[PDB]
mmCIF file of C-alpha atoms in Angstrom:
data_model
loop_
_atom_site.group_PDB
_atom_site.id
_atom_site.type_symbol
_atom_site.label_atom_id
_atom_site.label_comp_id
_atom_site.label_asym_id
_atom_site.label_seq_id
_atom_site.Cartn_x
_atom_site.Cartn_y
_atom_site.Cartn_z
ATOM 1 C CA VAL A 1342 -22.320 -23.277 -5.713
ATOM 2 C CA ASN A 1343 -19.254 -21.266 -5.260
ATOM 3 C CA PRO A 1344 -19.565 -18.233 -6.171
ATOM 4 C CA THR A 1345 -17.799 -16.263 -8.877
ATOM 5 C CA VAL A 1346 -17.259 -12.526 -8.838
ATOM 6 C CA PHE A 1347 -15.427 -10.247 -11.260
ATOM 7 C CA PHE A 1348 -13.951 -7.040 -11.115
ATOM 8 C CA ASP A 1349 -13.749 -4.650 -14.209
ATOM 9 C CA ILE A 1350 -9.961 -3.245 -14.544
ATOM 10 C CA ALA A 1351 -9.300 0.261 -15.405
ATOM 11 C CA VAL A 1352 -6.060 1.855 -16.186
ATOM 12 C CA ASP A 1353 -5.838 5.515 -15.539
ATOM 13 C CA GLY A 1354 -9.708 5.377 -16.575
ATOM 14 C CA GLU A 1355 -9.576 3.183 -19.936
ATOM 15 C CA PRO A 1356 -11.196 -0.140 -19.325
ATOM 16 C CA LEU A 1357 -8.559 -3.324 -19.586
ATOM 17 C CA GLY A 1358 -11.473 -5.498 -19.609
ATOM 18 C CA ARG A 1359 -13.329 -7.787 -17.261
ATOM 19 C CA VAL A 1360 -11.268 -10.710 -14.376
ATOM 20 C CA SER A 1361 -13.645 -12.925 -12.781
ATOM 21 C CA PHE A 1362 -12.550 -15.382 -9.567
ATOM 22 C CA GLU A 1363 -13.894 -18.429 -8.350
ATOM 23 C CA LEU A 1364 -13.808 -18.251 -4.485
ATOM 24 C CA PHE A 1365 -13.433 -21.423 -2.618
ATOM 25 C CA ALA A 1366 -16.637 -21.123 -0.593
ATOM 26 C CA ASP A 1367 -16.419 -24.740 0.707
ATOM 27 C CA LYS A 1368 -13.407 -24.780 1.993
ATOM 28 C CA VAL A 1369 -12.727 -21.579 3.463
ATOM 29 C CA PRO A 1370 -16.047 -19.832 4.414
ATOM 30 C CA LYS A 1371 -16.064 -17.046 6.126
ATOM 31 C CA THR A 1372 -12.843 -15.878 3.998
ATOM 32 C CA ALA A 1373 -14.928 -16.082 0.745
ATOM 33 C CA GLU A 1374 -17.955 -14.079 2.083
ATOM 34 C CA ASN A 1375 -15.793 -12.022 3.249
ATOM 35 C CA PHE A 1376 -14.442 -11.551 -0.368
ATOM 36 C CA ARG A 1377 -18.116 -11.836 -1.777
ATOM 37 C CA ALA A 1378 -19.733 -9.528 0.093
ATOM 38 C CA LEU A 1379 -17.227 -6.632 -0.459
ATOM 39 C CA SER A 1380 -17.571 -7.381 -4.314
ATOM 40 C CA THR A 1381 -21.091 -6.682 -4.394
ATOM 41 C CA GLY A 1382 -20.762 -3.645 -1.774
ATOM 42 C CA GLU A 1383 -24.014 -4.864 0.439
ATOM 43 C CA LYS A 1384 -22.615 -4.579 3.928
ATOM 44 C CA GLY A 1385 -22.372 -0.588 2.271
ATOM 45 C CA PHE A 1386 -18.920 -0.525 1.245
ATOM 46 C CA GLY A 1387 -16.439 -2.623 -1.199
ATOM 47 C CA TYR A 1388 -13.817 -2.794 -3.367
ATOM 48 C CA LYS A 1389 -15.962 -0.506 -6.250
ATOM 49 C CA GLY A 1390 -13.505 2.452 -7.097
ATOM 50 C CA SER A 1391 -10.563 1.306 -5.074
ATOM 51 C CA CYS A 1392 -7.235 0.623 -6.351
ATOM 52 C CA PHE A 1393 -4.292 -1.844 -6.652
ATOM 53 C CA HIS A 1394 -1.527 -0.347 -4.166
ATOM 54 C CA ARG A 1395 1.213 -2.822 -5.286
ATOM 55 C CA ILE A 1396 2.453 -4.213 -8.323
ATOM 56 C CA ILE A 1397 5.795 -6.574 -8.149
ATOM 57 C CA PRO A 1398 6.451 -8.094 -11.728
ATOM 58 C CA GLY A 1399 6.578 -11.877 -11.596
ATOM 59 C CA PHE A 1400 5.315 -12.110 -7.620
ATOM 60 C CA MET A 1401 1.887 -10.503 -7.540
ATOM 61 C CA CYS A 1402 -0.842 -7.650 -7.703
ATOM 62 C CA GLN A 1403 -1.895 -6.032 -3.942
ATOM 63 C CA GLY A 1404 -5.278 -4.118 -3.783
ATOM 64 C CA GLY A 1405 -8.179 -4.028 -1.122
ATOM 65 C CA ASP A 1406 -7.048 -1.213 0.694
ATOM 66 C CA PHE A 1407 -10.651 1.186 0.554
ATOM 67 C CA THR A 1408 -9.665 3.262 3.017
ATOM 68 C CA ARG A 1409 -5.706 4.434 3.522
ATOM 69 C CA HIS A 1410 -5.529 3.231 -0.351
ATOM 70 C CA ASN A 1411 -1.864 2.494 0.899
ATOM 71 C CA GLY A 1412 -1.917 -0.727 2.041
ATOM 72 C CA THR A 1413 -2.286 0.315 5.610
ATOM 73 C CA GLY A 1414 -6.134 0.226 5.651
ATOM 74 C CA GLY A 1415 -9.014 -1.599 4.922
ATOM 75 C CA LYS A 1416 -11.794 -3.403 7.085
ATOM 76 C CA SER A 1417 -13.769 -7.141 6.479
ATOM 77 C CA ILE A 1418 -17.446 -7.752 7.144
ATOM 78 C CA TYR A 1419 -16.700 -9.114 10.730
ATOM 79 C CA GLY A 1420 -14.227 -6.562 11.885
ATOM 80 C CA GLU A 1421 -10.943 -5.182 11.517
ATOM 81 C CA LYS A 1422 -9.969 -8.078 11.409
ATOM 82 C CA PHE A 1423 -10.682 -11.513 11.224
ATOM 83 C CA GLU A 1424 -8.547 -15.062 12.206
ATOM 84 C CA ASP A 1425 -7.025 -17.097 9.758
ATOM 85 C CA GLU A 1426 -9.494 -19.325 8.344
ATOM 86 C CA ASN A 1427 -7.138 -22.358 7.386
ATOM 87 C CA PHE A 1428 -4.062 -23.226 5.322
ATOM 88 C CA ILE A 1429 -5.579 -26.013 3.432
ATOM 89 C CA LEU A 1430 -5.404 -24.318 -0.473
ATOM 90 C CA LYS A 1431 -1.556 -23.810 -0.940
ATOM 91 C CA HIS A 1432 -0.462 -20.524 -3.526
ATOM 92 C CA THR A 1433 -0.149 -23.429 -6.577
ATOM 93 C CA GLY A 1434 0.552 -20.884 -9.022
ATOM 94 C CA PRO A 1435 -0.249 -18.081 -11.053
ATOM 95 C CA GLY A 1436 -4.144 -16.803 -10.911
ATOM 96 C CA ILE A 1437 -4.331 -18.111 -6.823
ATOM 97 C CA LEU A 1438 -6.254 -15.024 -4.669
ATOM 98 C CA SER A 1439 -5.015 -14.198 -1.486
ATOM 99 C CA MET A 1440 -5.464 -12.439 1.971
ATOM 100 C CA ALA A 1441 -2.654 -9.993 2.533
ATOM 101 C CA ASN A 1442 -2.052 -9.700 6.047
ATOM 102 C CA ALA A 1443 0.156 -7.853 9.072
ATOM 103 C CA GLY A 1444 0.518 -11.304 10.929
ATOM 104 C CA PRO A 1445 -1.524 -14.067 12.188
ATOM 105 C CA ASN A 1446 -5.228 -13.349 12.377
ATOM 106 C CA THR A 1447 -5.259 -10.113 10.848
ATOM 107 C CA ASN A 1448 -7.402 -10.509 8.093
ATOM 108 C CA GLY A 1449 -8.735 -7.005 6.581
ATOM 109 C CA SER A 1450 -9.942 -6.367 2.795
ATOM 110 C CA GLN A 1451 -6.607 -6.795 1.450
ATOM 111 C CA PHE A 1452 -5.708 -9.503 -1.678
ATOM 112 C CA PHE A 1453 -3.232 -10.313 -3.578
ATOM 113 C CA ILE A 1454 -3.364 -12.117 -6.747
ATOM 114 C CA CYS A 1455 -0.480 -13.871 -7.586
ATOM 115 C CA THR A 1456 1.559 -13.995 -10.941
ATOM 116 C CA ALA A 1457 3.851 -16.541 -9.791
ATOM 117 C CA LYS A 1458 3.668 -19.870 -7.721
ATOM 118 C CA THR A 1459 4.180 -18.506 -4.011
ATOM 119 C CA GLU A 1460 5.092 -21.233 -1.955
ATOM 120 C CA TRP A 1461 7.465 -19.467 0.771
ATOM 121 C CA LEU A 1462 3.598 -18.065 1.520
ATOM 122 C CA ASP A 1463 1.686 -21.322 2.719
ATOM 123 C CA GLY A 1464 0.697 -21.331 6.026
ATOM 124 C CA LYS A 1465 0.820 -17.708 6.308
ATOM 125 C CA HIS A 1466 -1.550 -15.976 3.466
ATOM 126 C CA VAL A 1467 -5.240 -18.224 3.468
ATOM 127 C CA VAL A 1468 -5.119 -18.727 -0.189
ATOM 128 C CA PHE A 1469 -9.864 -18.678 -1.142
ATOM 129 C CA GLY A 1470 -9.785 -18.366 -4.769
ATOM 130 C CA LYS A 1471 -8.205 -18.347 -8.393
ATOM 131 C CA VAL A 1472 -8.776 -16.269 -11.344
ATOM 132 C CA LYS A 1473 -11.481 -18.136 -13.486
ATOM 133 C CA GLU A 1474 -11.144 -15.874 -16.446
ATOM 134 C CA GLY A 1475 -8.808 -12.910 -17.480
ATOM 135 C CA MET A 1476 -5.656 -13.916 -16.495
ATOM 136 C CA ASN A 1477 -3.698 -12.005 -19.683
ATOM 137 C CA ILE A 1478 -5.433 -8.496 -17.953
ATOM 138 C CA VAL A 1479 -3.671 -9.550 -14.916
ATOM 139 C CA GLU A 1480 -0.349 -9.766 -16.655
ATOM 140 C CA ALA A 1481 -0.743 -6.397 -18.290
ATOM 141 C CA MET A 1482 -1.397 -4.891 -15.150
ATOM 142 C CA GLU A 1483 1.923 -5.891 -13.935
ATOM 143 C CA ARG A 1484 3.798 -3.679 -16.738
ATOM 144 C CA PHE A 1485 2.592 -1.184 -14.789
ATOM 145 C CA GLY A 1486 4.104 -2.077 -11.407
ATOM 146 C CA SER A 1487 7.643 -1.642 -9.716
ATOM 147 C CA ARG A 1488 10.691 -4.262 -8.277
ATOM 148 C CA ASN A 1489 9.415 -2.573 -4.662
ATOM 149 C CA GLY A 1490 5.482 -1.977 -6.129
ATOM 150 C CA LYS A 1491 5.362 0.726 -6.865
ATOM 151 C CA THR A 1492 2.555 1.459 -9.377
ATOM 152 C CA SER A 1493 3.275 3.790 -12.319
ATOM 153 C CA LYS A 1494 -0.376 4.232 -13.192
ATOM 154 C CA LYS A 1495 -3.781 4.658 -11.289
ATOM 155 C CA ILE A 1496 -4.764 1.045 -11.569
ATOM 156 C CA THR A 1497 -8.364 0.426 -10.536
ATOM 157 C CA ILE A 1498 -11.447 -1.532 -10.024
ATOM 158 C CA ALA A 1499 -14.070 0.193 -12.064
ATOM 159 C CA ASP A 1500 -17.059 -2.371 -11.061
ATOM 160 C CA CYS A 1501 -17.583 -5.230 -9.088
ATOM 161 C CA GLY A 1502 -20.257 -7.412 -8.105
ATOM 162 C CA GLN A 1503 -21.205 -11.036 -8.286
ATOM 163 C CA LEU A 1504 -21.838 -13.625 -11.514
ATOM 164 C CA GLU A 1505 -22.726 -16.493 -9.622
ATOM 165 C CA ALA B 380 2.995 -10.156 6.914
ATOM 166 C CA UNK B 381 2.540 -8.418 3.179
ATOM 167 C CA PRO B 382 3.630 -9.843 0.653
ATOM 168 C CA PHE B 383 6.305 -6.623 0.314
#
């Protein structure tokens, strides 16, 4: 029942592989549906073609700004922003998928994949999924980041959709 | 916010 979407990653044009996530629609239905819908492109816009604008080794990989591509844009399938659904799920380890935000109740389209356990973010960022397969591709992406997050190469979401 |  919980959806499974995927992202085919490409660094400067060459495929790196497919990463798939399980979205916990059973605990954060509104947040999960936002991500599912952005992955299939059914509302007319979404992640296909977007890039990871902030990558920080040993922390996380951030993307989802399909409008400004700099972490200033993005929008949800509800409006530019939506409230923090709940904080039931915590940042337990690598692979956790969570919402990036500009403070409370500012969820849009930006997300981040954790490569470490980021407990200091619990209760501030809504966790809504986890990497199902492909964790090694995410670690490989870290090699293109920097202490501050600026990327070394153009890491994009070549394609995406729903598997289940 | 962020994280940065």
